[PDB]
Structure 1
Amino acid sequence: RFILEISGDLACFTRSELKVERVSYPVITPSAARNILMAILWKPAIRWKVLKIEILKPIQWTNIRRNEVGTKMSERSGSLYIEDNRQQRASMLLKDVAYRIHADFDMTSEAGESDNYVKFAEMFKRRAKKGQYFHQPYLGCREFPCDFRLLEKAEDGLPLEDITQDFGFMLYDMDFSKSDPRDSNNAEPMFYQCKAVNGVITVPP
């Protein structure tokens, strides 16, 4: 297990229901935490899996109505012109957030030759301690980074000490087992928060 602390100023764990108005999730998405761990280090052999999220900063909603685009790019239209495809997508961002995601990893079917668990574990530990990453972690959206810092146990205070509020079904991690190399078609299996006592745990598939 790795107790990697994710911290940042603003966040945007955009809910699947409110994508037109990017209302952020109450806490960090387990799928977002797995994506962060993969952007720090990943390979066609290592399969990241989130185990437990421990909140370290109170939930603070901040509405930032951003102006987005609503039409994708392709080989057809050589240009976009946002003056004809403007989208005033709201974004209830999460100001001042901090989470120490306890998570580990397994092995995929295409592990290859170098399928050593200890090798990938040490590589992830070095990348988290020195500050190396394949891609900058994002707090639900790439417009917000993550001041990550690998913790050995606990090096920060948490506000949710007693029994708090349950956030219901949140997006655990989309099912990409039915997807070919480079995902395309997927599903959406979700899970309950159980109870945000101090550090909510995830239910592995």
Structure 2
Amino acid sequence: RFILEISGDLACFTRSELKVERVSYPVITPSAARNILMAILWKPAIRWKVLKIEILKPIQWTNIRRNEVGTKMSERSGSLYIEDNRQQRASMLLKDVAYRIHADFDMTSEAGESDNYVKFAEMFKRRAKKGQYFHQPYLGCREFPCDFRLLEKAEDGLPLEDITQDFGFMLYDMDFSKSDPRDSNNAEPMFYQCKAVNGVITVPP
């Protein structure tokens, strides 16, 4: 078990139902937390798994529209010209976000020789207490920072003290079972949370 105080400027957890309009999630997506944990420290033997999702700041939705292109880069066309395929998509942001997520790690099948638990635990602890990471984490989109800090129990306040409202179906994690390494085709299943008296809990498959 590890407590991560993920907090940055804004957030934009793009949902799976509305992919054209990057609407942000009310909290931190479990897939986003897994990607953050992989960007902080990951090896072809570890498997980051989220457990408890917590909230530390009230929701502040800001209407922001992003202007993108509608053509992918390839070896066929040399240039794309964004002025031709300009699309004014939506990307609602969440001003001032903070999450003290509780997540640990397990083991995979392609470990081999480096399959230690305490070694990876102390490595992640040192990386969180010193500032080492393979890539800067993202809060739904690679445009906001994540001032992660290894906490011991509780160090910040939460606004959701009592029962508020459930978020319904949330994107858990993409199915990586029936997929070769460096996958390119899978699904995105969702799941139900529980009671929101201080966040949401992620039920493992």
1:23 to partner: Cα distance: 0.8
Residues 68, 89 of structure 1: 8 Å contact kept: yes
Give the secondary-structure state (helix, strand or coil) at the position aligned to 2:3: strand
Give the secondary-structure state (helix, strand or coil) at the position aligned to 2:170: coil
1:191 to partner: Cα distance: 1.0
Q: Distance in 2 between matches of 1:84 and 1:171?
A: 33
Deviations 1:159-194 (A, max 9, x none): 011001100001010101111011112122211121
Count of residues paired in the alignment: 205
Residues 16, 188 of structure 2: 8 Å contact kept: no
Q: Work out the percentage of aligned pairs sharing the same amino acid.
A: 100
1:33 to partner: Cα distance: 0.4
Name the stretch that deviates more: 64-73 or 31-40.
Answer: 64-73
Deviations 1:42-89 (A, max 9, x none): 011000000001100111111111211221111111111101121211
Residues 176, 185 of structure 1: 8 Å contact kept: no
- Given the two structures, how large is their TM-score scaled by the length of structure 2? 0.97
1:136 to partner: Cα distance: 0.5
Q: Distance in 2 between matches of 1:87 and 1:39?
A: 30
Number of the residue aligned with 2:98: 98
1:141 to partner: Cα distance: 0.4
Q: Distance in 2 between matches of 1:188 and 1:106?
A: 22
Gaps of 5+ in 1: none
Give the secondary-structure state (helix, strand or coil) at the position aligned to 1:37: helix
Q: Distance in 1 between matches of 2:97 and 2:122?
A: 27
CA RMSD of aligned residues (A): 0.9
- Given the two structures, how large is their TM-score scaled by the length of structure 1? 0.97
Deviations 1:3-44 (A, max 9, x none): 011001110001112221111011110000010011000011
Deviations 1:91-139 (A, max 9, x none): 1111111001100111110012010011111111111111111111000
Deviations 1:132-160 (A, max 9, x none): 11111000000112111111111100001
Q: Report whether the alignment pairs 1:183 with 2:186.
A: no
Residues 38, 48 of structure 1: 8 Å contact kept: yes
Residues 40, 134 of structure 1: 8 Å contact kept: yes
Q: Distance in 2 between matches of 1:51 and 1:198?
A: 14
